[PDB]
């Protein structure tokens, strides 16, 4: 979307996958979905490094929703939204923050709040605007494929329409299968900034896995139609929560990295652990998915040892290298050269462990290196020429 | 097994899921199959807590064999183990510990090194006894299911005849589906201390997930079966590893103590964490495991909500309950009675966390409480009537 918006992947926060729809304030004051979770949120983004990182977006998901007033505009439950949306952007805004909401092209969202119809696409786009809103995500529940295809596009233009710069977050993609020719991507480019192309993320390694795999499958699809403006949409980054273990959450964060996907958490950052925290704010990871090309990476090799390496092409002649173990029994010597790795001419490199920080010199292309590679986890290269 | 052995699951440390098939001394000194890793894992196993609590085998896995001599008698490689196994069997009698080792009924380990076929079966019978080991596995590769049948029956005798208590560890069921009517569990209570039932455990929740899936599927059958010296055995303990979450962790303590399963880590007790050693030296997650009257646990409840309910009966009218999430959203609060999960009426009950420490006291049947569980989580609770 030519909206002078996400020329690199969003960064930030979404309140979904750790939060869910626990509108329970009564019981649940400190977790529920509040004016308050969103404030504290926030607080600890401008205080904890989160937002000097770059991570800038607070999204807002589903069942933040009161009804629709007396003359149809939405308004957010007032329980738990008493000061309403307006304050809730003003304080984002003050923390250098951006305020993402959430929507449904259909009868309802998923979660059954009232849904943007097709004739209240424009009312609801004037209201986000109105409210400062920086974001939407546009849900797709309840709708038929002829209301998606006449709703996606019009809420694009609505959204255009009001003058307020606006990232839009379409998930029209993933109720359609998420490939041609049911899916047209020339089209998701020129109308958001980015599309959830599949299935919900869950708290498991099992959901990261079924994710990549996918996207892997259909790579030679969906790797050109990313970048600077319009991303892939993988979901979700898990780290900080219950399913994954250290190496899984190390693995996500660099294979999310590769793809230039969104980095867009879903944790309590009020009692996040400093190994997530060290994750999540690794400043050459954060580089690397930001880089200014917005190329997103492929797999490049798999091997029968289980070892699969991804690599995507950055700025200045660099690259990220990801080596990534599916193997279940131990630590593994990964044996290869960039020779290998389809790496040409007479360059000689060096590479920086993203995670390790050490430094691998004098790699020319027919350099056999060995990399230990823990189950389930990563071992990533920012690799570049030197002279 | 009527040998005296194992009245209670046997407790230790198994060299395979973490350190496998690894020969490489060369390269990796400190993680290949070699007497140099037996002995510093026995040293931990002295030092830090663990055979106090309980742990006491340190178990051989397969890749020990070095052939046979020209008497046939079974010898370890000689540059893994060059002080050969009495010295190892020595070493660790004199730390406490006890030796447990690996052979295959069949024609080959199923690494390939030497089997253990029927005509080898008595003389690495009286080899292992005057070895002094304590515990033997013996597998099932590379061989017909009737040479099984004669086999391990035969295993049985045969160190029944050397006068000394060895620990019989069977994994014939896992060759023969596991269930009726190829699997004659009175048969093989008769003939083994514990039997492996299923699949090798991964490093991975999913393989966790599976093994757990299949025991409550067939818990009908298998319940029953198990008892003390004669125990259903799930697999290796994947505590302090790669695959599981700090919550998956807990999850399998909790799961393989209310199924009365050996409790068999295979880690490294070198680098293990406080949080993981914490799991594994639980002093009443141990005393629940080693209760006097070995009856196995069940699953008594499965909610639409995704929470399971397994109940164990313990010596004292004790009780083991733990409820285990098998949501992958976020924590959640379920809501449940004693009289709910089928207790007996008019006893007052007093619960104690096994995790937490906490103690919950007078519980009747109708009274309502919330556990908080957290997404491939548990909560585990020691329960008793009170006067
Ligand atoms: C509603 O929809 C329209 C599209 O139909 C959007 O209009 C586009 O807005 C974007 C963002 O503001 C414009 O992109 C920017 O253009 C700037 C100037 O380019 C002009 O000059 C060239 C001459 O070759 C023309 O071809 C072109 O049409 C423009 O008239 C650039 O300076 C900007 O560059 C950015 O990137 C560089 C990195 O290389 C940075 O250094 C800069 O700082 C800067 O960030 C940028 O490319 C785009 O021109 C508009 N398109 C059209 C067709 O008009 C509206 O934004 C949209 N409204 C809303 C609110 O959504
Ligand atoms: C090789 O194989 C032989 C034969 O199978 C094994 O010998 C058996 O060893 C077990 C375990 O030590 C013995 O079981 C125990 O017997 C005790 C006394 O039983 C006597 O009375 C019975 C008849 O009632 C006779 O059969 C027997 O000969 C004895 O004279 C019991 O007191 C023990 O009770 C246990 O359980 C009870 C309740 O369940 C508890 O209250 C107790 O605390 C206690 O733990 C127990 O049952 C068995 O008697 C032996 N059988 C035979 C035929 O000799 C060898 O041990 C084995 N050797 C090796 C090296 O592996
Ligand atoms: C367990 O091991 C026995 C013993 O034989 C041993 O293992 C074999 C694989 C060979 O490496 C032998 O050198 C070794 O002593 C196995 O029995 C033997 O199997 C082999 C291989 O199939 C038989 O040879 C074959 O004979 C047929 C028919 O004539 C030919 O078509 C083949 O080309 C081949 O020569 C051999 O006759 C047999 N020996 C005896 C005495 O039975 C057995 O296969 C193995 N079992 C299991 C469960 O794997
Ligand atoms: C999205 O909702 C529309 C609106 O109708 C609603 O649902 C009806 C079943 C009923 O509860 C009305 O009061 C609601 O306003 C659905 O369009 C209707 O579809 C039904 C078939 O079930 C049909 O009988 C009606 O004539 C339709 N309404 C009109 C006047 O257009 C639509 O089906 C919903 N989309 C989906 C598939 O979820
Ligand atoms: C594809 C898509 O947007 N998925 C969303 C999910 O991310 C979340 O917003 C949920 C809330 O009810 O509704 C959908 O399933
Ligand atoms: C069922 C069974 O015993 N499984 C074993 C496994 O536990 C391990 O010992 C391995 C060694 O090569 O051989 C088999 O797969
Ligand atoms: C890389 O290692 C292999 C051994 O597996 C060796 O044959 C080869 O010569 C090495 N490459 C170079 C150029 O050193
Ligand atoms: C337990 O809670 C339920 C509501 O879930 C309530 O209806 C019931 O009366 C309660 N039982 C007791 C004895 O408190």
């Given at each position: 979307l030519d909206?002078?918006?996400?020329?690199?992947?969003?960064?930030?926060?979404?309140?979904?996958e750790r939060f869910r729809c626990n509108i329970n304030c009564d019981e649940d004051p400190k977790n529920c979905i509040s004016e308050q979770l969103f404030m504290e949120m926030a607080d600890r983004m401008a205080q904890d490094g989160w937002r000097?990182?770059?991570?800038?977006?607070?999204?807002?998901?589903?069942?933040?929703?009161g009804g629709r007033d007396?003359?149809?505009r939405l308004m957010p439950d007032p329980k738990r939204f008493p000061h309403?949306?307006?304050?809730?952007?003003?304080?984002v805004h003050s923390l250098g923050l951006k305020l993402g909401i959430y929507?449904?092209?259909?009868?309802?969202?998923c979660m059954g709040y009232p849904g943007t119809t097709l004739d209240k696409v424009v009312?609801?786009?004037?209201?986000?605007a109105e409210w400062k809103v920086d974001m939407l995500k546009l849900d797709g529940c309840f709708s038929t494929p002829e209301e998606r295809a006449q709703g996606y596009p019009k809420m694009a233009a609505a959204l255009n329409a009001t003058g307020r710069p606006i990232a839009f977050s379409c998930s029209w993609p993933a109720y359609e299968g998420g490939l041609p020719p049911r899916v047209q991507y020339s089209l998701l480019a020129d109308i958001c900034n980015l599309w959830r192309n599949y299935d919900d993320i869950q708290d498991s390694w099992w959901s990261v896995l079924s994710i990549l795999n996918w996207f892997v499958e259909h790579q030679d699809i969906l790797q050109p139609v990313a970048g600077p403006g319009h991303w892939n949409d993988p979901d979700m980054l898990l780290i900080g929560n219950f399913g994954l273990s250290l190496e899984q959450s190390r693995a996500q964060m660099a294979l999310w990295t590769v793809l230039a996907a969104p980095l867009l958490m879903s944790t309590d950052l009020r009692t996040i652990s400093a190994q997530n925290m060290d994750i999540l704010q690794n400043p050459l990871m954060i580089?690397?998915?930001?880089?200014?090309?917005?190329i997103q990476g492929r797999r490049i090799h798999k091997e029968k040892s289980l070892i699969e390496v991804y690599m995507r092409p950055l700025s200045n002649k660099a690259s990220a290298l990801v080596f990534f173990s599916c193997r279940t029994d131990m630590p593994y010597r990964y044996h290869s050269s960039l020779g290998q790795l389809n790496f040409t001419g007479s360059v000689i490199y060096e590479a920086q462990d993203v995670y390790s920080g050490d430094i691998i010199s004098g790699l020319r292309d027919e350099t056999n290196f060995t990399v230990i590679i823990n189950p389930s986890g990563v071992v990533?290269?920012?690799l570049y020429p030197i002279k």
């Open positions: 909206n002078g918006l996400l020329q690199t992947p969003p960064m930030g926060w979404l309140a979904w000097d990182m770059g991570y800038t977006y607070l999204n807002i998901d589903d069942c933040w929703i007396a003359s149809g309403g949306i307006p304050f809730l952007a003003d304080y929507a449904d092209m259909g009868n309802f969202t009312q609801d786009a004037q209201t986000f580089k690397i998915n930001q880089d200014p090309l917005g990533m290269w920012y």
